[PDB]
Amino acid sequence: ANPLYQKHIISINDLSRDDLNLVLATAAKLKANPQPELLKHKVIASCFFEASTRTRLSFETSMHRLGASVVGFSDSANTSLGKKGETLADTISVISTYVDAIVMRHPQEGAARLATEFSGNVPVLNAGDGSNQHPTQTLLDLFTIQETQGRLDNLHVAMVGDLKYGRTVHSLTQALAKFDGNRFYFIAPDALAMPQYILDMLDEKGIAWSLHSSIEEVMAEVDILYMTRVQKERLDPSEYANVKAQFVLRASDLHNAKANMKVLHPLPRVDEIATDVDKTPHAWYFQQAGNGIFARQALLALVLNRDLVL
C-alpha cells in the first residue's frame, strides 16, 4: 500500500516532499529496469480537450511501456461538443465505468478536480487544467533537475519569461519550495513578473529570491536555467520588441555558465531559445521531455499498483 495508491494526481499542492521523492525514486528504478507487463490488463483513458504534443504522446507512450491499453481523444467530436450538454460530469461518470484511470487536459481551471467527484474509484490524473495546475510537468522537471544536479536542495534556479501567467513555473517554484536552501532568480518583463502570492509564499518559508533585468546578470551562478516562452500576444508588439533581447537565450550567452548548468524549457518554444544552443552541452530540454516518460510511468505504476516490488 504505497502512499500514492489509487490517489488522484490533481494539484502540486496535494503532493508532499515524500510524495515527490517516492515518484522520482520509482521513475529512476523503472528507467533502469522497465516492467513492460506491469499494467497489463489495464485500460487507460487519454482525454485531451485542449491541444498537446508532449503531454499526451508521452503519457500514452508511458501507458504502453507498462503494457496498458489506451482509449481517448485529442479534441471534441464526441458527446460533449456534438450533442450539446453531455456535461463533463456525465462524461466522466460514463468513461469511469470503462477505464482504470483517467488522464485529462482541459481549458477550464478545476476540471480535473471536478472529474474526481464523478469518477468513483477511478484515479484521474491532471495533464493540465486552465491556468491552474500541471503536476506531471512539474514531476518531470524535478526528476530532470534531480537527475542532472543529483539533488533538489540548495540549488540556484533561475526562471525566465512569462512568470506572471505560466502555470508550470508557478508549480515548479511551489514544488522546489518544499525543499531546502534553494535560491530563485526571476527574470521577466515588468508586465509579466512572477506574481506577488508566489513571493509571499517564498518569504513565509525563508527562501531567497530576487528580480533581475537580464539572464547575463545571473548566468554565472545558476544550476538550472528554466526557460519558458513569452507569448507576444500578452504584450504590445512594440512593447515586446523593446525588452525581447533580455529574455531570449543564445549560445554565446552560455560563455560563463557552470559546467553543471542545464538549460530547461517545458516546450514548445518559439524563439526564446536560439537553435545554436541545441548543440551545447547545456541544452537539456529534449532530455527533459524524454524524462516525461519515466516520471509519468512512475505515476501510473504508483497509482495503479498497491505494492511495487521493484
Binding site: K232, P237, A241, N242
Partner: protein, 144 residues
C-alpha cells in the same frame, strides 16, 4: 596606394566596414574600390577603412553613417590631396536600411521603403516609424 580622386571613409569601428558596404550598396559601381578591415589605427587598435574613387557623398549620405560609425571621418580627395574632410552628423530621417520592430506594422508585407524619424535624447537615439508611428530605441531597431 592613394587614389587620385574619390572618397575615403576613415576610422570605421571594427565589424562596421562590411555592414556599410552591405546596407548602402557601396560596392555597386564600376569605380575602383579599396577596403581595409581590422587595420591598425594607432590607439583604437583596429578600424575599417573604405576608399571609393571618382565618387563623393552629400552631407546627407554621410550623416547616414552616424548610427554605425559616429567617430568616422569622411575624406574628400581630389588630385591626390585630402581637400575637405567632415564627420557624420545625426540625420533627420533614416530610410531603407532599418526594419520596424513592430510585427504588426504595415511596412513588412507591403512594397514600401522603411523610414524612421530621428530624435536624440536620454543617452540614446529614438527612431519613430513613418507608418505605425511607434517609437523605439536605436538599440532595438539596429538589433535586427
Amino acid at each position: 596606394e592613394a587614389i587620385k580622386r574619390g572618397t575615403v571613409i576613415d576610422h570605421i569601428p571594427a565589424q562596421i566596414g562590411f555592414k556599410l558596404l552591405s546596407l548602402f550598396k557601396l560596392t555597386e559601381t564600376d569605380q575602383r574600390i579599396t577596403i581595409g578591415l581590422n587595420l591598425p589605427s594607432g590607439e583604437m587598435g583596429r578600424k575599417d577603412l573604405i576608399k571609393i574613387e571618382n565618387t563623393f557623398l552629400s552631407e546627407d549620405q554621410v550623416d547616414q553613417l552616424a548610427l554605425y560609425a559616429p567617430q568616422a571621418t569622411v575624406n574628400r580627395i581630389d588630385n591626390y590631396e585630402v581637400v575637405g574632410k567632415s564627420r557624420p552628423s545625426l540625420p533627420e530621417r533614416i530610410d531603407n536600411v532599418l526594419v520596424c520592430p513592430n510585427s504588426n506594422c504595415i511596412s513588412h508585407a507591403e512594397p514600401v521603403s522603411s523610414s524612421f524619424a530621428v530624435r536624440k535624447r536620454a543617452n540614446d537615439i529614438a527612431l519613430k516609424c513613418k507608418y505605425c508611428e511607434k517609437e523605439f530605441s536605436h538599440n532595438v531597431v539596429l538589433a535586427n
